Every structure is written in C-alpha cells, then in structure tokens.
C-alpha cells in the first residue's frame, strides 16, 4: 500500500518460546528428564515472559493509537507533547540489553 | 513587549525517529 520501506517496531521475543516452557512444564512431571540447558532456558523464559508480553502489548497499543492519531491530522499538533514523552521513554528503553 | 508563544511542540514523525534509533541500535 506504500512504496516506502516502513521501519515497523517489533519486540525481540518470539511468542512461541513460552510454548516450549509449557512442554517442559508438562514433560518434567511426566517422568521424562530433559537436558539441564533446556531446563534453564525454559525456566528463564517462563519467569521473563510477563515483561515481554506487557512490553509487546504496550507497543502494539501505542502503534494503534498513533496510527489512529495520524489518521486525523488535526489533532497531532495537540498530541505532540505526549508523543514526544512516549518517544523519549522508547529511546531510553531501546538502549537496554 | 507583549510576549508571543515560542516554538510549539514538534511532532518528529515516527519514521524519522525509528530510522535514527535503528541506526543507533545498529551502531551499538
């Protein structure tokens, strides 16, 4: 729909990784023993999932509301300050590993 | 000396900010 190359923002987190955890979370009590590296990866992903899902839902909501704003250009001038503070927080966060 | 409002809050379109931060991520 646009000839330009859109630099769409995403989140460095595959939603399917938690799925793997659940397999472990099920297979561990099934009696099957899995490699300890897999156990550590699954445990870390399971404990870190809430942050990732909150971040991805937040960024998706921000993108939806910003495209809704720019749809009605008469309001972007008023919303500019809020968009600036949001972009500032994004800029602070993106540097984080 | 009736002061007038200074420069207004800017928009800084999402594409430019995203490109700049993509560059910053590439260089980090």
């Amino acid at each position: 729909g646009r000839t330009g190359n859109v630099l769409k923002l995403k989140v460095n987190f595959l939603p399917e990784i938690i799925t793997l955890s659940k397999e472990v979370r099920n297979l561990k009590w099934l009696g099957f023993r899995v490699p300890l590296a897999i156990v550590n990866k699954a445990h870390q992903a399971n404990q870190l999932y809430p942050f990732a899902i909150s971040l991805i839902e937040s960024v998706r909501t921000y993108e939806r509301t910003c495209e809704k704003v720019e749809e009605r250009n008469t309001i972007s001038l008023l919303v500019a300050g809020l968009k600036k503070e949001v972009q500032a927080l994004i800029a602070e966060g993106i540097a984080l590993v | 000396r009736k002061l007038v409002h200074d420069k207004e809050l800017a928009a800084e379109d999402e594409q430019v900010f995203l490109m700049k931060q993509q560059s910053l991520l590439a260089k980090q």
Partner: protein
C-alpha cells in the same frame, strides 16, 4: 419530502433502546397465535456465530434462570473476523437467533455472569485479560479490561467466579501459571488480592479449573493439568496450598463440588473429570479417591453436580455421549444416557439452576438443552439417607 433528515437520523445511532426493545419484542413476535429418562427439548446452533466453532464455557444466570452465556476461542475458519465470540442465549421464546452477542479481541476461554449485579458478564480470555461486558447496553466492545501486568494475570485464564453475597462479593480468577487474583465488580483495573499459588519447594501448580465448597467462601479446591487436586485456603491464617491429593493419573480438566444441600452435609464431595474417562468422587477429609469411575477410556471432559439431586450429576464424553449418573439407585451403570446426533465432540456441560434440565456445549457450536425424567429429577429424604449409607459402603 425528506431525503437527508431520515438518512442522517439513520446514520446517527440513537438506536440503543430502539434496537434493544425491537430485539426483545420481535423474537416474541415469532409467536404463531394465528386464529386460522432423557428427552431433547431445545437445540440451538447459531449458523453465524457458531459455524465450526468450539464452545469454550457455559454458565446459567443465577439472577435470571433463563439466560446462558457461552464463549468461543479464535476461529480458524477466518482470522480476520472477530475471534473472541461470546453469546447470550435465552429461555424466553423459541428462536434461532441469539439474544446477545459480544466480541473480545483475544480468544475467550471462559465466561460467566456476575452474582453481584444481575446484568454484567465477566469472562477470562486466552491472553490472561479479564473482560467485562454490560448486557443492558448494546455494545460489541469490552466495557472494561484488566491490565496485562506482572501482578495481574498474564497466562491464559480458564476459571473466573464471583464469591460472597451481593454486598460482600469478590471476583476470583485463575491464571494457568497459578496466579489467583481477586477483583471487584465496580473496578476491573487493579487486583484487590493477588498471589502466585505454590504447593512446595516454590514450584507452582498449573491450575486448570476450580470449584468452591457450596455456600462457603474461601478454602477453594483446584485441579492441575499435572494430575493432582489441591485444597487451598484463599486467605485463612495462611494462603496457598493446604492439602495435596493422591488424585488421578492424567490431566484433571473438570472439577466441581457438591451443591445440593439437604438434611445431611455433603459439601465436602468433589467430582473431578480427568482425561481418562475417570470421573472420580472423593471428599476433602480423605486423601484417597472415594470411588473410581470406569466405563470406557479416553477423555471424559467434565462433570457437574445437579443442584437439585444430591447423588446425581452430569458428565459428558468427548466422543459424543452425555450420560446422567445417579449414585443412590446405581453405583456403576448409567441411570440415564444420550448421544447427541452427529456423534460430535461435546465440550462443556452446565446444569441449569434448580436443575430439571441440562445445557450441553459442543465442538461444533451446536449447544443442546434438555430436561430429565421426573422420577429421577426430584430427590427425597430417602435419597439423602441412602446416599449417606452408600458413602458408608466403603
């Protein structure tokens, strides 16, 4: 002759009461008043909102024992179309059309009415976000949505209920990670209570569904897909797991407590329909299963007590047979049985309040409700006494 005033008054949507009353009156206008044992009673299959769609939950309105809420997950038939489908189906007059519809942006896993207010509907979705809907208002969007936060539910939510009375209510909800959270019906944006349920050595319990002892708040009973039942006091002197059960071998899908109250106290009896045809009966005071259910294999979904009969309940097998179990007359043979046509994967069962009929979900969306024989619908003091002595059997 107007050309735009009617057009713009049609464009302007002041049709809330208009549409509400038109719907409540035209399904009445279906009435043909023209002057010139088990048995099926009403089969409902919404072609528009249940085409190749699996029923996700079922509830009967306690305030209005004619209103049923049913859910739906995402539809693989089309992803673009709204995924979370919630339906409100009524017992007022015969009609193919659903009485109300509702959409949730995430797949809806469970839903129910609220006991605190006779009109709000609360449902847990696959994203772990509790969704609120107002029946009186005619809207498709969720009215409220709990935050998707670390403290709040994040994993898919399968069980939501309202505890307490209409002035001491509290909305309890579970996340399949094991978080229990209590909210209020007035505000659905911050967990009034919240903690990650744990059994031992800090490992959680993958809770699938719970029930609560009838007439009692706190001290719930939960089931784990791990294959274990747990009794956990909501607050008590110490929240968390209070008792672990030997339980059933496979995943425990449906759990329910005894509800019929009579001359004897039987509120300590749990039914658990695991994934192995094994609708087990037991009591909170005994760590072992009380009686083992075995007639076939391979996934009986669930079981719920008939609120009217103390020794009778309904369990459905995913192969396509719903069967009514009396315990007083028979311990092993099905006192009543039926198979829904098409032999489909019947999912969820809900006894209507006051009993006398049953509601049955299906993987195809064709929900069927139907009554029960009078000779087995009604209890008697003989039933309670003989149930007590059958408990004394073993």
């Amino acid at each position: 002759l107007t050309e735009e005033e009617k057009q713009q008054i049609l464009h302007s949507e002041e049709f809330l009461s208009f549409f509400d009353h038109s719907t409540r009156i035209v399904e009445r206008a279906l009435s043909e008043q023209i002057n010139i044992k088990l048995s099926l009673n009403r089969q409902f299959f919404d072609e528009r909102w249940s085409k190749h769609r699996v029923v996700s939950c079922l509830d009967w309105s306690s305030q209005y024992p004619e209103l049923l809420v049913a859910s739906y997950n995402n539809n693989e038939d089309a992803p673009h179309e709204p995924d979370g489908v919630a339906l409100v189906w009524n017992m007022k007059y015969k009609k193919t059309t659903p009485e109300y519809v509702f959409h949730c942006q995430s797949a809806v896993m469970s839903a129910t009415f609220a006991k605190f207010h006779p009109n709000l509907v609360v449902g847990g979705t696959y994203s772990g976000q509790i969704v609120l809907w107002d029946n009186r208002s005619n809207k498709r969007t969720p009215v409220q949505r709990t935050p998707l936060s670390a403290a709040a539910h994040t994993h898919p939510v399968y069980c939501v209920n309202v505890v307490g009375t209409q002035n001491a209510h509290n909305l309890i909800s579970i996340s399949t990670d094991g978080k229990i959270c209590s909210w209020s019906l007035d505000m659905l944006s911050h967990p009034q209570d919240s903690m990650e349920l744990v059994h031992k050595q800090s490992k959680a319990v993958a809770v699938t569904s719970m029930s609560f002892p009838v007439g009692d708040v706190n001290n719930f009973v939960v089931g784990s897909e791990e294959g274990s039942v747990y009794t956990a006091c909501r607050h008590g002197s110490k929240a968390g797991i209070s008792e672990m059960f030997e339980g059933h071998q496979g995943p425990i899908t449906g759990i329910h407590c005894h509800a019929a109250v009579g001359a004897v106290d039987f509120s300590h009896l749990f039914v658990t329909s695991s994934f192995d045809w094994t609708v087990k009966l037991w009591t909170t005071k005994n760590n072992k299963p009380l009686y083992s259910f075995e007639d076939n294999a391979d996934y009986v979904y669930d079981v719920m007590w008939s609120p009217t009969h103390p020794a009778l309940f309904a369990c459905v097998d995913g192969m396509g047979r719903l069967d009514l179990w009396n315990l007083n007359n028979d311990t092993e043979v099905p006192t009543a049985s039926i198979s829904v046509e098409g032999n489909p994967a019947l999912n969820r069962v809900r006894w209507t309040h006051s009993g006398r009929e049953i509601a049955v979900g299906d993987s195809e969306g064709q929900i069927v409700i139907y009554d029960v024989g009078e000779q087995i619908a009604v209890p008697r003091n003989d039933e309670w006494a003989r149930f007590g002595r059958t408990l004394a059997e073993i």
